[PDB]
């Protein structure tokens, strides 16, 4: 609650399995300001992005571009368990 990062943030959607983001994992390499507010709001579901947006470097795609981290264009299961 509040400004505390949830261990896991879920993204609901139809068709594909919901996506999941782990603060626990990412906090092992990044500080809050490396993602907030430039990439994400300090509020879940405030702004929704698509896989296409990620392909353009937005949302998860800002890092999951095949160079900084595994591409968001593949490995669907990694983020949609
Ligand atoms: C990028 C790798 C992140 C880092 C580093 C941190 N956060 Fe985060 N946070 C991130 C995402 C992808 C999301 C989900 C956004 C969405 O569209 O749903 C979040 C969300 C939060 C929230 C809101 C949670 C909620 O409303 O239930 C908070 C309060 C939050 N994050 C806090 C936070 C803090 C304080 C961090 C440093 C310890 C931190 N996050 C790092 C991505 C990333
Ligand atoms: C983590 C780096 C991801 C990978 C790899 C894939 N997806 Fe994803 N997807 C992810 C998130 C966090 C979200 C929600 C973002 C938000 O702000 O709501 C999504 C969303 C989708 C959606 C809905 C939007 C759209 O593009 O139509 C679908 C249908 C979806 N994702 C499918 C999908 C498939 C099939 C993937 C492999 C080719 C894939 N995603 C990978 C995070 C990540
Ligand atoms: C850069 C600031 C990142 C943002 C924004 C997001 N992720 Fe990430 N993620 C990043 C790195 C450098 C790594 C490690 C290297 C690699 O390629 O794996 C990761 C890893 C993940 C993982 C796997 C975790 C594990 O158990 O090994 C997942 C499933 C993942 N990232 C998902 C994810 C989603 C859904 C994001 C958008 C909401 C997201 N990441 C943003 C760097 C960054």
The CATH number given to whatever domain includes residue 77 is 3.90.10.10
Structure solved using which method? X-ray
| Residue whose structure tokens are 């990439």 | 39
Eight-state DSSP code of residue 30: -
Q: Which residues line ligand 2 (CB under 6 A)?
A: 11, 13, 15-16, 19, 48-52, 59-60, 64, 72, 74-76, 78-80
Task: Look up the domain containing 31 and give its range.
Answer: 1-81
Q: What's the CA-to-centroid distance between 69 and ligand 3, angstroms?
A: 6
Cα dihedral 13, 48, 22, 25 in deg (nearest 10): 140
Two tokens, residue 27: 């906090």
Report d(CA 63, CA 17) in Å as an integer: 21
State the distance from the centre of ligand 2 to the C-alpha of 51, rounded, in angstroms. Answer: 5
Within 10 angstroms of residue 63's Cβ, the number of other Cβ atoms is 19
Rg (CA), the chain: 12
- Structural domains of the chain, count: 1
Q: How far is CA 45 from CA 10, 49, 71, in A?
A: 9, 9, 22
């Amino acid at each position: 609650k509040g400004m505390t990062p949830p261990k896991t943030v879920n993204f609901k959607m139809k068709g594909v399995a919901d996506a999941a983001f782990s603060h626990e994992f990412h906090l092992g390499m990044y500080k809050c300001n490396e993602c907030h507010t430039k990439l994400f709001a300090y509020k879940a579901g405030a702004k929704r992005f698509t896989m296409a947006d990620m392909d353009k470097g937005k949302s998860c795609g800002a890092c999951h571009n095949g160079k900084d981290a595994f591409s968001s264009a593949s490995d669907c299961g990694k983020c949609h368990p």
